[PDB]
Write a protein that binds this ligand. Structure first.
Ligand SMILES: O=C(O)Cc1c[nH]c2ccccc12
Ligand SMILES: O=C(O)Cc1c[nH]c2ccccc12
Lengths: 502, 502
């Protein structure tokens, strides 16, 4: 296997569990916003620059696959160019430059170090250890190349807003370029590259432990700070702003990884098909990383589009977790024989039902302890979420004799079909308010008002799959992929119930 | 070699370099006191409990040397008992219980996790990997055993101060005992021990990455928070309080490690002399760890003796660094043949001259940029510190041909003897204000007012040592040990100049 895909769910649990820890700490006022800045300044000014310096000094530039960098970088430049040109065409005259600066940086700049690296490490540390290098190459080179352009557009806006001024272009270009130079990521990569040549790849033995201590502290500390900064950030956006945010998160989490995968396949004219495939799959995985928290920091510094950029960075972080898991497994399935593939979809189902059961217990606990379950539409919703919890427990049981199998099936498919029933009954309440057994097998199938609208929309968008999937077993490539998307939905429907009511 | 003693200086540079980073960040107001609490709450409530749980679940209790635990624990109980009984006898009636509570906890509770573990790891990870277990065993079991007694004395004081009350003993005992149970170290060790039995030693694969991320972030993050909390903490103490602080830091950093070493040699009646010697040396290294930052937190919570305890914890942290380095090398020398031992003292000299040169550059930079060097006694002091910087550079050169050797000697010993000259001339200003070459060898020898009083008081110790050393080589065990203490002084005299004027 090219990806150690089994290691991805443990790594996602590290990543988004530590982000959830920081979010819980901020929500519980264990760490207030003014206290969080100590972790943020530790992370950004000490742990991250030490991690960057360490890895840049160690880096074997004579063994880097430059065509991977070129590919991801051209893919990011493509999404940057598309989002920028399109924004200048679509946006209102008084704010087209603040948007044309921050929207392209949003759509291209990844959460490479905090979230990307634990995931790339998990997937590729053993199978393709060279892939861990390109986190430290891509992320800064792409800030260096793309961010000054977006900063230049924000400086143009700052100039334009300052209507009493009429000054010349070179201060605009210089000030935006100076802004990327002042980023620790950029200057520590220049410094680390310099010391890579000076020291060879060898960190001095007496400095090594110090850089290890700071660098190794970045991962958890940065994920936790990301959690803290996500508290109270999703402000209720206008309809247009929410559409723009959806477009930009789609640019980052769908268009960019598709273009990354395509660019690798265009430019990586090396021979080995497995190396080419794993590099293509890594390019996709790279594109799926959420928006860098630094973009929200730039937006705060300029005082421009900060609502959309912060909300979008938070939502991108959350939305990346399932997209990353789903994408990586989906890219691994082409390499798997049908028996390991059936195993794999049950592993996927177990993983999603773990997170969904946790999310459902929390959602139910809120709706029950708040006693909201007696009001409308919460009266129906709590039925749906109990039924979803029974679904997830059914899968965690099914992951671990013949009589138990038949019993656990009826638990799972009475509650599953019931969750579809409640999905429809719940949607309707918003409108009013306004074949044979097959025991010798591993898979199981073949035997408030506005927020509630969003839940029923997403759940109905999910519903397609287990409809088709069972009449089609009564096949081929798209069946095992939609078997996966209906398993994802069967067990992960509660995660959407949670993401909206938690 | 029982200790990988060469790894200790890199580890100390990690430990006290990251502490110095946090101190620099707090001094520069990169992180204000109110911002530092975010790092503190991350460290104490997430990264430390995850580290504890991880290591306690992994722990092979069927392979622990219980006699080491018994030894360190009885040594700590001995120092606790001595400091407690002696404090109740010596202290003034109105505060004898707050002191009898916090002074014994001070004298016994070590900075085990932030500072102790990187050092034990460095020294013993390869040679005696089992020694890393006892950090996680000793530290909580000693909180559990000794801290409730000291808390009980602080509760007795709180009761006594609350003169309108006359309540019964069982609330006092229960409330102090509840205070140790509420400590994350204690409850996560109970929880981790429980899950060690439940899970065997095997952390669940999907929880493992999460615990790794949080736990691995503790080391650097806790050292940095320790640095932040050390900013502005050494308040100018009374003469009596400074003597008491010196006695308590001597209890922690001298009496406790001596008793730990003795207790191991009393109780470790196993056979192998090298295992016995390395365990004895580890027991000493364990006793040398500075005071736990938690003691200052207890003192803040009780609002008792907080000045002495905080100052003492900061000074203990700083004083531990040289004592730890000096002690570990000194304990390694008995195992070394005279040629590796001569090598070793030059390695020691290089290490101390690195830190001292850094410290001297900073000290000089302050005295020069402040232009204090024109006032008294700074006029002489800046001469001393230039001469000390030339000494340290002389050693770093001597660590890396025959003509260069003769040149670098005269640099080193003109400046060394001159630093002794200025040591005397400087002390006097305070009172007024109020043999043959031997080129075939590796060692070099054988060819404000109140703060200034403290500086000159300690360089007297040093004038002493190098005196004896050369006239005697013009031998035996105490000579190679004092050869080391005069090398320590020759090159580390600038570090004392820095610790007082920086
Ligand atoms: O986007 C990144 O991965 C870099 C980064 C810079 N400052 C951060 C704070 C928290 C989490 C990640 C980062
Ligand atoms: O004393 C220890 O090593 C434990 C510890 C608990 N809270 C701390 C904060 C900073 C550094 C260390 C600790």
């Amino acid at each position: 296997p090219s990806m150690s895909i089994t290691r991805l769910f443990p790594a996602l649990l590290e990543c988004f569990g530590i982000v959830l820890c920081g979010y819980i700490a901020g929500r519980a006022n264990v760490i207030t916003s003014t206290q969080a800045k100590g972790l943020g300044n530790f992370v950004s000014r000490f742990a991250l620059p030490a991690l960057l310096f360490k890895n840049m000094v160690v880096l074997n530039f004579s063994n880097v696959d430059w065509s991977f960098l070129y590919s991801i970088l051209i893919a990011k430049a493509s999404v940057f160019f598309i989002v920028c040109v399109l924004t200048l065409l679509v946006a209102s005259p008084d704010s087209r430059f603040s948007k044309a600066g921050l929207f392209p940086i949003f759509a291209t700049q990844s959460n490479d170090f905090a979230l990307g690296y634990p995931i790339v490490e998990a997937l590729y540390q053993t199978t393709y250890p060279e892939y861990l290098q390109y986190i430290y190459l891509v992320a800064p080179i792409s800030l260096m190349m793309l961010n000054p352009i977006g900063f230049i557009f924000c400086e143009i806006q700052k100039w334009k807003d300052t209507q009493n001024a009429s000054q010349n272009k070179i201060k605009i270009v210089g000030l935006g370029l100076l802004r990327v130079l002042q980023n620790p990521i950029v200057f520590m990569v220049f410094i680390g590259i310099a010391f890579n040549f000076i020291l060879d790849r060898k960190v001095p033995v007496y400095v090594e432990n110090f850089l290890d201590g700071l660098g190794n502290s970045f991962s958890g500390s940065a994920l936790f700070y990301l959690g803290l900064t996500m508290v109270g950030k999703i402000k209720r956006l206008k309809k247009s702003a929410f559409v723009v945010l959806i477009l930009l998160i789609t640019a980052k989490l769908l268009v960019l990884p598709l273009l990354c995968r395509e660019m690798v396949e265009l430019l990586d004219k090396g021979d080995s098909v497995v190396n080419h495939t794993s590099l293509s799959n890594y390019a996709f995985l790279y594109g799926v990383f959420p928006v860098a928290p630094g973009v929200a920091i730039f937006a705060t510094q300029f005082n421009m589009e900060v609502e959309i950029i912060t909300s979008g960075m938070v939502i991108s972080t959350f939305v990346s977790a399932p997209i990353m898991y789903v994408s990586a497994w989906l890219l691994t399935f082409p390499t798997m024989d049908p028996k390991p593939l059936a195993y794999a979809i049950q592993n996927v189902s177990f993983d999603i039902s773990i997170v969904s059961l946790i999310s459902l217990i929390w959602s139910l606990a809120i709706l029950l302890l708040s006693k909201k379950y007696k009001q409308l539409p919460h009266m129906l919703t709590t039925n749906l979420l109990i039924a979803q919890s029974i679904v997830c427990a059914g899968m965690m049981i099914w992951n671990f004799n013949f009589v138990g199998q038949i019993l656990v099936f009826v638990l799972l498919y009475s509650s599953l079909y019931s969750t579809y029933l409640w999905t429809g009954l719940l949607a309707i309440s918003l409108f009013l308010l306004k074949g044979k057994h097959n025991g010798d097998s591993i898979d199981s199938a073949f035997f408030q008002l506005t927020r509630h609208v969003l839940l029923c929309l997403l759940l109905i968008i999910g519903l397609f799959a287990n409809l088709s999937s069972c009449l089609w077993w009564l096949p081929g490539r798209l069946y095992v992929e939609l078997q996966f998307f209906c398993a994802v939905f069967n067990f992960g429907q509660g995660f959407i119930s949670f993401g909206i009511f938690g």
